Design a protein around this ligand. Structure first.
Ligand SMILES: CO[C@@H]1O[C@H](CO)[C@@H](O)[C@H](O)[C@H]1O
Ligand SMILES: CO[C@@H]1O[C@H](CO)[C@@H](O)[C@H](O)[C@H]1O
Ligand SMILES: [Ca+2]
Lengths: 707, 704
């Protein structure tokens, strides 16, 4: 049932370390590789920077002719000699705190303006930010691939070389996201027009969906400026759908090019989204890859985990992220393409004692492989550092190959993994709770995000009150998911798109955080779920619109719900819990028809009901809550207990996090203390003296049981 | 030298605990007060909520006639019996997560529209947000004072009673901050017009400053919307000055009313600005009280410190805030009116072991007193909480007076403070570095802040490239102040407004973080400073404009500086440090006649010089750096060493922070470990081997 890497037909935990040959004295390459191997790591990972190897236009060095550390060929040979497999990452973008994100200076000086990402005014957004489908950009990228790809092809595992995997480019859209502006390049605009014409066929059909009055497709322009009408929302929704096809076109072109060199190894891509040590926006960025993941079953996405510290302030980010990757990529192992080791920034410390706990928590949280980023510190040669001379701090090795404090933490974690990987990789958590991932709520990177310079989406101007970004960040990511993890209830996340009823009916409960809009397909799937025997928890709104904000009352009518939206105090009572603070004055007030009222406004109006519908159960709460008070954890606990869901352990300290993982042979108990307190507690299995445990601040214990 | 509270004619560390009688079972009031006194606390602090006591219009309950927890009189008698002094805070605003921010529901229902703060369209901003100078609001505020102030007068220290201090209202302007919305109430706008007429006298004078085309003051509208033109920046700048006068008018009306009751005790106000565990915006909030602090030497401002956690991620916030308060309030002790104890937010943990370190670091960082907020948890009466039933978590005591983990930390820190206060309170750090506080850069709460989401200020539309909030947050607060503290170099901050030349001449170096604009008085002050023998460090720009963005090149011409602004790579070299990352492509390239070039672009153009001017020295860098690389610490260290400034100790571990505090007799060395690492290190001056746990401290005393 588990998805894991396999080596020689056996479960294999992928343990990689990032070692940048181009930032290490080549006389010390072998020492870095040997010391990585000695931690039990099986793989090494590096970028191959285009700027580093195409030293001038059409002048290539991969053999150290012009600089010893340009000898890629010798680095590849050393990996094979030191029995490490190799992950190569030739870009064209590498980011990697490298000048111009890895693109050659000579290229950026030569490209015309139309090669660059442009704002709504036609101005260059950033001097190192290209437009991905720029003709000029792809012509130069292809000429770079013509030189680096024959080397990668020759050194593949199938030809007895060390190369097992290759990353295509780096965090597609990360540069656009961090710039705070979207790409209005004329290639984007023209491709968008073709997309719209293919989608709608006639202007009359587009006008009927948008409620616009265009005479022809020629009158329609890519949406710019703030959303003031539902028709602007519709245009931006289609723009989001278009950018997912656009990123799929980019990675398809790179992949087709690469395959033409006889490169048959596993292709990877890496998911950005952590910033300031939390990952609440990563679900938005992963959502931009929806069409790539649908179209390329042979590209494995891995996470870029950058926690920076390990405390209750960010404990939920890594689990939520691992769960959402699983939902969008159910057929591949969850793994971290970049797994924080040291710090990319001197002023943002990375303590070995934090990261060691992160590594263990990641195993508890179901990670199946990772690449320590950065295992080895680098020193940038020849002024190539974006931000300074030194690349990373507080790593496993310094640039000179000296062991630092983190080395012994990685050796300890890797030792446990190698001893246990045969069983541990095959273990599952018993999740009786499924949480719905409704991708369209995440499609706002053009209009609403933590990074976007201009807020383009104000839902109040559309006569709505439930902002999809507020819902998915505060009600879902920081709310329900944070709540369930804190309460030690296992959950899975399932992508609702083309979702199998069969793959929902194994859960005791399905939880749906709903806005006022939801497509007909999803409204029909949730209806069938309940009619057929499913138990559904749905808040803060019964939706009544589709993704284009047109009438769609399928779920409301199938559930026999009548409601009015009324203004009241933020506080409600729910299941006998008084003074539950809710996010909105407006709430859904339900008729008590064929239902039990279980939530009341300050005027005792019904804002939550429970009902039996066909063979199923429905609980609706017409109010929004995340986790910003103790009442919210009480409410989540009450809702879970409606279907008699029990934690796996009784633990005497509610602030201790645990995960039980098991298969037929083995049970692993992970205890995680995310708090600055030495905690002494006792526990027992919820079905039969209690064991006592002492756990340091920001620390962990792992217990293995045979059977 | 030092400013400190006094008790029995000796230095007194003010140790207060916040205990909300109105949120606590009255049967347990005496228990709470006894457990607070048993920590060594000398004072207890509480709101007196207007909503809680004026239960209906003109119906007052201070004796528990209608609810036992409305017996304020009995709470005051218990403070007296348990030998605690009392800080009272009657509002009218209390915030304190209290419904309507403490204003009666009956008041908010009955006020006219024109009593409320209005957006530019004349719409009510928030149904609990009144206009501070609303006639109706002040009428009802005065009637609340008429009942609560005679009780406070009767029990005040000037009549021997337990009440030693009173806070006026609560965090004035905190609602214009949190929303970014200014009050456009017609009475406010009429006051803004009076301010402008009074300031410029004639429309011709104002037109010449703003470059506007008005025929009269009748044509003048309050600024709104985004700044597109230099004339809009000018109008918004005076709108900022106006709000500083407005808040001084409000707090003066409250103060005159209070004094009319014969209340002669110390009056207080509290400074907001921490959010998400850092305080980089608090300097903006303190700048809103510039006119109050100028005109009321008798009102003591205290800080509201909410660190949430204690690490290198926020180590610099509390010191920078304490140093800025000292700059703006040199004649009163630096203290925390609200000093984090527990957490306002269940999901935002406050570890006893973090706050214990924060408490000791605060002593290192010059705090002279504090009020643990919240010492006691509260239970909101009858749904009167803004949020849920419970007020604060992980406090010293829960609402039922159960001791929690923080209690023992507070008792430990208080025992240390009581043992040392006599000598500790009279100690200062030896600062050879002075950092200038130029308040106009901070006057942006209406146009540019962490809490305004739609920014009205885009300096590129004005032909500028150095944004004053970016400068004061990233180059000053998180850059230079963070770097000096990390390097363990003492600094003082000085308010440049009406600044005495003599109070700059004690320092070996004055550091000025400058945008492209600076008023004639500050340009003149800095010119004189260097000519008379001062050492000035100035970056990232020689200013060429005044606060109205009109030409002003006093400093530039007095120092014989010429430059062109040119685009280059972000990285420069400076004092032989290669690859210094700078904020801007645009840099000042200096004519090097009679100068030494000390910084270079990637094309080797001169973006920094040193120069002798009269008896003094000038170091100008035409590029902006904060602290985002090891080269930035190397550059700060090189700059400090230009005038041979030394740290007080050699400590073997660079990541240990220390503060040396001395007077003639006593030295305290505070070692602070802001890192998740047990650190062993040794130290010696400029048995010497020491171990400190993660996120922990050690204090060493040396007799001199
Ligand atoms: C500039 O580097 C990028 O920064 C983002 C914001 O922290 C991260 O989400 C990405 O994983 C990282 O590659
Ligand atoms: C709403 O409560 C206020 O919140 C601000 C934002 O965190 C703080 O700066 C203030 O001190 C606090 O009183
Ligand atoms: Ca000159």
């Amino acid at each position: 049932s588990e998805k894991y890497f396999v080596k020689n037909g056996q479960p294999h935990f992928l343990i990689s370390g990032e070692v940048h040959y181009f930032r290490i004295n080549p006389k010390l390459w072998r020492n870095h590789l040997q010391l990585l191997k000695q931690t039990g790591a099986d793989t090494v990972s590096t970028y191959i920077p285009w700027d580093w190897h195409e030293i001038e236009e059409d002048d290539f060095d991969f053999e150290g002719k012009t600089h010893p550390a340009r000898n890629l060929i010798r680095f590849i040979k050393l990996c094979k000699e030191e029995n490490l497999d190799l992950i190569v990452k030739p870009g064209p973008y590498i980011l990697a705190e490298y000048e111009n994100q890895g693109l050659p200076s000579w290229l950026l000086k030569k490209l015309s303006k139309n090669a660059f990402a442009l704002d709504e005014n036609g101005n260059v957004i950033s001097p190192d930010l290209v437009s991905y489908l720029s003709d000029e950009f792809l012509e130069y990228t292809f000429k770079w691939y013509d030189k680096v790809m024959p080397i990668i092809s020759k050194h593949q595992k199938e030809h007895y070389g060390p190369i097992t995997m290759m990353q295509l480019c780096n965090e597609i859209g990360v540069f656009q996201w961090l710039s705070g502006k979207s790409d209005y390049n004329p290639k984007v605009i023209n491709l968008y027009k073709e997309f719209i014409i293919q989608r709608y066929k006639t202007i009359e059909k587009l006008n009927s969906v948008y409620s616009t009055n265009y005479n022809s497709f020629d009158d329609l322009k890519a949406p710019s400026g703030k959303i003031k009408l539902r028709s602007d929302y519709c245009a931006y929704f289609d723009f989001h759908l278009f950018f997912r096809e656009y990123y799929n076109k980019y990675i398809s072109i790179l992949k087709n090019k690469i395959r033409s060199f006889g490169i048959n190894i596993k292709l990877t891509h890496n998911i950005p989204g952590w910033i300031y040590g939390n990952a609440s926006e990563l679900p938005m960025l992963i959502s931009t890859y929806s069409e790539i993941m649908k179209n390329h079953p042979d590209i494995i996405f891995g996470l870029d985990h950058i926690p920076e510290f390990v405390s209750f302030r960010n404990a939920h980010s890594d689990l939520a992220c691992n769960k959402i990757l699983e939902a969008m990529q159910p057929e591949a192992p969850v793994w971290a393409a970049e797994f924080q080791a040291g710090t990319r920034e001197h002023h943002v410390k990375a303590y070995a004692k934090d990261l060691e706990t992160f590594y263990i928590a990641s195993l508890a949280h179901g990670i199946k492989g990772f690449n320590y980023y950065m295992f080895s510190q680098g020193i940038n040669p020849e002024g190539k550092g974006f931000y300074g001379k030194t690349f990373y701090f507080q790593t496993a090795l310094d640039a000179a190959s000296n062991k630092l404090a983190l080395y012994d933490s990685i050796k300890k974690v890797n030792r446990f993994i190698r001893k246990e990987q045969k069983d541990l990789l095959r273990t599952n958590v018993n999740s009786e709770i499924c949480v719905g991932f409704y991708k369209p709520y995440f499609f706002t990177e053009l209009i609403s995000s933590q990074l976007l310079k201009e807020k383009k989406l104000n839902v109040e101007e559309l006569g709505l009150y439930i902002d999809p970004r507020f819902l998915r960040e505060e009600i879902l990511f920081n709310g329900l998911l944070r709540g369930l993890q804190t309460l030690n209830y296992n959950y899975d996340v399932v992508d609702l798109e083309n979702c199998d009823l069969k793959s929902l009916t194994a859960y005791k409960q399905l939880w749906i955080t709903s806005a006022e809009f939801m497509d007909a397909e999803t409204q029909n799937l949730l209806s069938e779920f309940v009619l057929n025997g499913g138990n559904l928890i749905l808040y803060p709104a019964v939706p009544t619109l589709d993704n284009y904000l047109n009438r769609c009352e399928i779920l409301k009518n199938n559930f026999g719900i009548e409601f009015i939206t009324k203004d009241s105090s933020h506080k409600v009572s729910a299941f006998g819990i008084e003074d539950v603070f809710t996010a909105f004055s407006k709430k859904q007030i339900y008729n008590d028809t064929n239902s039990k009222p279980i939530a009341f406004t300050q005027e005792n109006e019904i804002c939550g009901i429970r009902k039996k519908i066909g063979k199923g159960e429905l609980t609706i709460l017409g109010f929004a809550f995340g986790y910003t008070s103790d009442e919210h954890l009480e409410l989540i606990d009450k809702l879970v207990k409606l279907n008699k869901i029990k934690r796996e352990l009784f633990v005497s300290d509610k602030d201790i996090q645990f995960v039980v993982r098991e298969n037929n042979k083995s049970r692993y108990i992970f205890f995680l203390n995310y708090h600055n307190e030495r905690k002494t507690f006792n526990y027992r299995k919820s079905s039969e003296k209690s064991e006592e445990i002492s756990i340091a601040p920001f620390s962990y214990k792992v217990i293995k049981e045979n059977k």
